[PDB]
């Protein structure tokens, strides 16, 4: 995580 988990990535998609 964050960007490397698909869920934590999308919760803050600005941060992936």
From Swiss-Prot:
Job description of the protein: Alpha-conotoxins bind to the nicotinic acetylcholine receptors (nAChR) and inhibit them. This toxin blocks neuronal mammalian nAChRs (alpha-6/alpha-3-beta-2-beta-3 (0.39 nM) > alpha-3-beta-2/CHRNA3-CHRNB2 > alpha-3-beta-4/CHRNA3-CHRNB4 = alpha-4-beta-2/CHRNA4-CHRNB2). Also exhibits inhibition of D.melanogaster alpha-7/CHRNA7 nAChRs. In addition, inhibits alpha-6/alpha-3-beta-4 (CHRNA6/CHRNA3-CHRNB4) nAChR with a higher potency on human (IC(50)=1.49 nM) than on rat receptors (IC(50)=31.5 nM).
Impact noted for substituting residue 15 to A: 2.4-fold and 15-fold decrease in ability to inhibit alpha-6/alpha-3-beta-2-beta-3 and alpha-3-beta-2, respectively
Tissues where this protein is expressed: Expressed by the venom duct.
Interval of the full protein contained in this chain: 49 to 64 of 68
Name of the protein in question: Alpha-conotoxin MII
Protein family (similarity comment): Belongs to the conotoxin A superfamily.
Cystine pairings recorded for this chain: 2-8, 3-16
Effect of residue 10 to A: 1.5-fold decrease in ability to inhibit alpha-3-beta-2 nAChR
């Amino acid at each position: 995580g964050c960007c490397s988990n698909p869920v934590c990535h999308l919760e803050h998609s600005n941060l992936c």
